Amino acid sequence: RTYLYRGRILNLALEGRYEIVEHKPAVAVIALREGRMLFVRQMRPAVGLAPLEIPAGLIEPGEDPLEAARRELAEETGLSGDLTYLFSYFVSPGFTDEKTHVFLAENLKEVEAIEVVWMRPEEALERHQRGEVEFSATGLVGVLYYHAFLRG
């Protein structure tokens, strides 16, 4: 593997014919409260718009997924809660190694750029189907996870 670039949140390498983008692993937090899911929106230069996401971010040096999940929830929404690991996924294994660890947050307490968007998952879904809002993988995963296991 050879490198063509080494930057802030990514390196661009070449492994023979394959173009590989190394990226720091990330976390995402699914939080539901009174039927509303905790989404967040921010300007994303990479896409020219603000998709609907859930609290998420890069794992800093020294921390593990869980600790990163806690930090992101606090920094982006000013909240904290009981976190449970759910699952993980590679965002696009065809070109990048970014891996995202997803957590569930419960019993949210308030302890303390990014827009906090509390919204019913059914509503995020309907708005998206109408072409009103775009989803990031984290936002869609949150919506689907809810519909599957949190309607109880």
Ligand X SMILES: Nc1ncnc2c1ncn2[C@@H]1O[C@H](COP(=O)(O)O)[C@@H](O)[C@H]1O
Distances (CA, A) of 137 to 14, 53, 91, 92, 107: 26, 8, 8, 10, 24
Q: Which of 118, 43, 134 is nearest to 78 (CA)?
A: 118
**Stretch of 32-40, 67-75, 85-93, 103-111 contacting its own copies, by CB under 8 A:** 85-93
Give the SS3 label for residue 150: coil
- Convert residues 104-143 into a mask of x (bound to Mg ion by CB under 5 A) and - (unbound): ----------------------------------------
Q: Which of 58, 35, 41 is nearest to 120 (CA)?
A: 35
145 binds, among its own copies, Mg ion, ligand X, none (CB under 5 to 8 A by kind): its own copies
**Stretch of 62-70, 71-79, 110-118, 135-143 contacting its own copies, by CB under 8 A:** 135-143
Q: Which residues are catalytic?
A: 110
Return d(Cα 116, Cα 96) in angstroms, integer: 28
Q: Which of 28, 40, 55, 57 binds Mg ion (CB under 5 A)?
A: 57
For residue 103, with 0-12 CB atoms within 10 Å meaning exposed, 13-18 middle and 19 or more buried, which class applies? buried
- Convert residues 12-51 into a mask of x (bound to its own copies by CB under 8 A) and - (unbound): x--xxxxxxx-x--x-----------------xxxxx--x
Sign of CA dihedral 42, 46, 49, 52: negative
Tell me which residues touch its own copies (CB under 8 A).
4-5, 7-10, 12, 15-21, 23, 26, 44-48, 51, 53, 87-100, 125, 128-129, 134-137, 139-141, 144-145, 147-149
